Amino acid sequence: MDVLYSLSKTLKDARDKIVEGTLYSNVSDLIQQFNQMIITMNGNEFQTGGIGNLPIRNWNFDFGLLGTTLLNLDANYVETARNTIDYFVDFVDNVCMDEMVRESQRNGIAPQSDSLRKLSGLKFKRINFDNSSEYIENWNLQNRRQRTGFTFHKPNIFPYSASFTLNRSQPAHDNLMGTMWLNAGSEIQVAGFDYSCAINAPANTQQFEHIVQLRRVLTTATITLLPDAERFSFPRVINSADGATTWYFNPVILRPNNVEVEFLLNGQIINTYQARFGTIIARNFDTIRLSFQLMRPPNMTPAVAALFPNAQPFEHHATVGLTLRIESAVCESVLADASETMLANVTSVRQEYAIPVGPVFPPGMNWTDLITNYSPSREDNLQRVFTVASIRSMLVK
Amino acid sequence: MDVLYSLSKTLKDARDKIVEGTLYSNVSDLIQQFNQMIITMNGNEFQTGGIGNLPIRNWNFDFGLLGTTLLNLDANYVETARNTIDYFVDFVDNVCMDEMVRESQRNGIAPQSDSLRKLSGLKFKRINFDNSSEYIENWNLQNRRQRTGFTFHKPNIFPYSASFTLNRSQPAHDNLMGTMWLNAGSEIQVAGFDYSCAINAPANTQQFEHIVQLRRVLTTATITLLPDAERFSFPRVINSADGATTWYFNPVILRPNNVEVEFLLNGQIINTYQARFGTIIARNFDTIRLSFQLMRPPNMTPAVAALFPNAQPFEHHATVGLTLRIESAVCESVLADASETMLANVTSVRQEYAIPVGPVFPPGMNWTDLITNYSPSREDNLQRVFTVASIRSMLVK
Amino acid sequence: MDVLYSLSKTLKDARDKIVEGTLYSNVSDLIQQFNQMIITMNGNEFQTGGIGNLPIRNWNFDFGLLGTTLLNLDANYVETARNTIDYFVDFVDNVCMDEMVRESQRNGIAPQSDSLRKLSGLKFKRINFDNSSEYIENWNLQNRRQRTGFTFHKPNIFPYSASFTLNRSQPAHDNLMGTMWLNAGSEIQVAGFDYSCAINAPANTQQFEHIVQLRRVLTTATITLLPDAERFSFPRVINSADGATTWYFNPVILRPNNVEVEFLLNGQIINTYQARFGTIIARNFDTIRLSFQLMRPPNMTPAVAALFPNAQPFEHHATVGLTLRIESAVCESVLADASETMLANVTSVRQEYAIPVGPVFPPGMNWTDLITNYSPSREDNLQRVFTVASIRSMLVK
Amino acid sequence: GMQRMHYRNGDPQTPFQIAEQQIQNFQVANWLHFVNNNQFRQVVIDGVL
Ligand SMILES: [Zn+2]
User: Fold this and answer.
1) Which end of chain D lies in a sparser environment, N or C, as judged by fewer CB atoms within 10 Å?
2) Annotated binding site of C for Ca(2+)
């Protein structure tokens, strides 16, 4: 594996620093490294493919070095080089792709392909270098057994979940009390509704609560918390819990009362915020708990009083809500987020080559399914597969 | 052009690696490269500016070299250097800006300024080095003709479009059926409404469809798809199609039925998702087609039944919708997105210097106008201009 | 200060470029730099911690050097090295953290800890190297005195503010006119409402205006401007200005008329856009002014006419709005944004070690409080503290 | 006391130079850089070409 990495920063820091002009002395430390490779290779036979729509191309080697020592790089030098790189490019592609489709439960955090199983070989180890690519940096630290770490803008930690829970309901669904929400990606919106506007509730206050359990701990999270759930602020006709009928939701929004957000880790409160809207920091948590209340307005102008009668029918449904968005965070496990193309790269290569569903990943690399049952095997395979996608993107986008 | 690039990574990897302390050896390979430049320069004169509110300044070159003599850089070494760099800084700025304004149809792509037309000259090429800046990496590969590629976040592919289409309407606008939408940036929200709640529709289901044609293909897109269009979930008074009057929209939202999203490429379905909300991957497409239906609820509680009578007036308007956001994607053509400052840099330099409208770009570098008629000339000029902005941002932000 | 930096790119460009395999000529320029350090160190005693729930550890040195012989790196070489790096890692951590807590007031922009006050010493300066980390790049340019600058995605310039202003009101709150808004982070949503639908207004048009003053100038901003304020498009029960009662808001939305956005700098209009929705560029501004109007529809279908009677009660409240989002921008001062982890890192280290509230920063490093009263002292301390967080993240995430 | 390896050499590259990136000691160390990278200063005009 680490092998693989080099093969690239080799080419990038190559197809990039090697252009008509520059002095030799700008690549002395580079040229060398390069050659070293060619040698180790020359002679060894290879094969890639054998699955779905993936060609089976063979690769033979027999190349010379670069002794042409001329102060300044003359055009002629480049072309005689680019022609030798374009075989490694078109190669690596066919290499990444081959080990980017095979999966394994007996452990996938390891080489699978007849291409790579031969790379981890010892005689090839003579190649590694410049591991400043965020992903490899993390691959190593892991295979040595120690704390990892990655960066994400609008991470994708919440499997899609859009539902409701009726805490008080009746057949006619004309006097309900409960919550409805949408957990998806890095965002949570939750609304608490009480058709009776807490008319018979103790202290004329109805308590609500929404708990979300992350499948992985997030640390150093920058979060936006805002009152109101716009998504649940409009009239809706919804299916009943049993699917037998439909109910009507006609919200009128009030400010959430006694808002308390707790970011817990293993049941312990790590961060707690009382009615603080705007930007807040949650430094380490595996659970978010949002508690908020609907308090019947003690003083009401006529127009307001008219919405909340002492007796049914209750036609305007008092609703309070919250919106929470994780802008950025760090996770010790790889995850999809709103900026990185890893998930999309892996998913795209598999789709393009009609790769059959395997034993580890859900059909279509479905994110919701993956994060919902994020087993150790799926994570090890995902990390291997994400790290390869990142190696590939250094050369092929 | 490639010339230009170097001139910078030269200075950055310079104004950065050269300070009171460091041991020679980390810059031996660097110092050299540097000097080489100075030589090639000295003697030649340059013409920068001469348009709008742009200062016309002349530049002569006659500077010393470097003291490879000392071991560990002494403060005195720095200052005698920084003073020589600050002429190149204040220079390049005046250089970028000059070619970041001119445009031409026929040969729009190539260099235009009396400053740069002289740089592409042959006697200068002796300068290139370390081309790892994502943008140049892509400039080159393009002059050779290959699968280029750029990375974005909330890309800006959809020209602003906010409108509606009434499939069934009448003068009173009291029983309409159609769709309304907002396509902007990387997001699409579309709602289908049927004032009659499919009372007389076959299978009590009204079909809707929204098609969006991208001006450029997007590959490896990570997309969020959610049911409902919040933007079209509230009461509105809208202008009629002919502008002669205004109609009333009073939505009540139902779940979109039989949702199907197709990402097509040249008329072919590349990806298709049936009712899958959350995160989905669209690997290569130039068109998005969203199909969804409003199905009259077969079972209704009294409160719901009351909203949907068998005869007009129809006072609650059944509405179903979808929201789609492209979080990230790759495009072979430069585009504006939510993270890169290129468009803003180019637009800002032109605005600050009162640069007159030219023959290629729309007034004010207006994004909507640009992407709506993204001609080859506009793209070549945009890429040239974006690449220069990126070269400039390595030194001046 | 600059000292500190090196200590890291030293280790990263180390724990990265030094693995089982690579040839010597890939790091010759590197090994050297490294050793140089060891020397300067060994013999000098350090001390860290002491405040709050932060341990107090002592450090001593007399570590061996590194063979500059072997051509290929043998495993044995690595391990005898990693063991020496893991003392510097676990060290630096304890170093950053120590100076990532103390605060001054005047001259609070400089070093504070007994650990760092000794680093700025002269005999240690023999270490600086490769300053290509966006943040240090900017620290230096500032020390000397120049035009700094950083890159932000969905920046955090607006302190949380959610309120309203009633321009026409009466005890019953049955015929109000005014605006309500939410300024938070990089977004502004503002709605103008007129319960009377401009029935008695000159030209049947009610003018609205929303002004937001940034605490710091933003340059090169890419902004999304859209009509409508979804956040204020639904029914609400709101507390009166004096908190004595609650009023009812029942909006019906119309298109904002004569929209004009001005981005001003010191009272001068730098950019102005008339009814342009979509993506716009604001190149340099410290104030945003949004002006928009509600114009009573001159022609109304019956359904619309019914919402707007000539006499009270006014039951449907005409509302027009705007949404503005700063996707990206450059600021000469450090700020929190939606991608960088700096604020979260600083806030997290302080929270984890139970660091007492100091004289500079608001309790909990509260962003809203910080940006609301962004004094020079808070900014200098924030920059110092953010730069240290960035140095730390090169090694520890 | 630096022997250990009486220094093994094989021609090509700069056998003096290499001593620079070798042992440590400042006095010793400056000599090396000053001598090693010490060259001639190529100078033109002198009151006529
Ligand atoms: Zn974003």
Assistant:
1) N
2) 266, 286
Q: Which residue has the tokens 């707790």?
A: A262
Cβ atoms within 10 Å of A318's Cβ, excluding its own: 26
Token duo for residue C206: 């009610």
Surface of D (1-49) touching C: CB under 8 A: 5, 21-22, 24
Give residue A12 CA to ligand 1 midpoint distance, Å.
29
Spacing of C-alpha B341 from chain mean position? 9
Per the listing, tokens 């000599």 go with D31
Binding residues of C: 153, 266, 286
- The DSSP element (H or E) to which B354 belongs, if any, is none
Residue A275: HSE in the Cβ half-sphere, 13 Å Cα cutoff: 5
Sort B24 into a burial class: Cβ within 10 Å, 0-12 / 13-18 / 19+. Answer: buried
Question: Cα–Cα distance between A156 and B386 in angstroms, integer?
Answer: 31
CA B258 to chain centre: 32
**Per the structure block, which two tokens stand in for B91?**
């220079």
Domain with CATH 1.10.1350.10 in chain C: 1-158+329-397
d(CA C20, CA C80): 12
The residue in chain C having the minimum alpha-carbon distance to the alpha carbon of residue B18 is C129
**B340–C327: do the CB atoms touch at under 8 Å?**
no
CB contact (8 A) between residue B69 and residue D21: no
| Touch criterion met for C and D (3+ Cβ pairs within 8 Å) | yes
Q: Give yes or no for a contact between C362 and C331, defined as CB atoms under 8 angstroms apart.
A: no
Cα–Cα distance between B346 and B391 in angstroms, integer? 12
**Residue B28 CB burial class (10 angstroms; 0-12, 13-18, ≥19):** middle
Strands (E), B104-249: 150-153, 158-168, 177-185, 187-194, 205-227, 236-239, 246-249
The yes or no reply on domain C159-328 and CATH 1.20.120.430 is no
Could you give phi then psi for residue B126, rounded to 5 degrees?
-65, 20
A-contacting residues in B 209-238 (Cβ below 8 Å): 219-222, 224, 226-228, 230, 233-234
From-to residues of CATH 2.60.120.170 in chain B: 159-328
Find the C304 Cα to ligand 1 centroid distance in Å.
Answer: 38
Q: Helix (H, G, I), strand (E, B), or coil: what is residue C389?
A: helix
Q: Fold for domain C1-158+329-397?
A: Viral capsid alpha domain (1.10.1350)
The radius of gyration computed from the CA coordinates of chain C, to the nearest angstrom, equals: 29
In angstroms, what CA-CA distances link A158 with A213, A227, A323, A374, B347?
9, 20, 14, 12, 38
CA–CA separation, C293 vs C198, rounded Å?
A: 10
Give bridge partners of residue A319 from the DSSP assignment: A193, A253
- Chain C contact partners (≥3 CB pairs within 8 A): A, B, D
Count of helices and strands (H, E) across chain D: 1, 0
Measured distance CA(D1)–CA(A158) in Å, rounded: 65
CA distance B11 to B3: 13
* Cβ proximity of A387 and A139 under 8 Å: yes
User: Structure tokens of B66?
Assistant: 């470097």
* Burial class, C40, CB count within 10 angstroms (exposed 0-12 / middle 13-18 / buried 19+): middle
Residue C10 contacts residue C25 (beta carbons within 8 Å): no
Beta strand A57-59 with A46-48: parallel, antiparallel or unpaired?
antiparallel
Instruction: Measure the CA–CA gap between B390 and B346, rounded to whole angstroms.
Output: 10
Q: Tell me the residues of chain A between 269 and 328 that have a Cβ less than 8 Å away from chain B.
A: none
Separation of alpha carbons C83 and A335, rounded Å:
31
Instruction: Record the tokens describing residue B374, joined without a space.
Output: 């993204």
What is the identity of the amino acid at B158?
A: F
Q: Which of B375, B384, B389, B387 minimizes the C-alpha distance to B102?
A: B384
Q: Please tell me the number of Cα atoms within 13 Å of B338 on its side-chain side.
A: 28
Both tokens of B7, joined, read: 């001139």
Specify the 3-state DSSP secondary structure of A33: helix
Cβ neighbours around B358 below 10 Å, total: 15
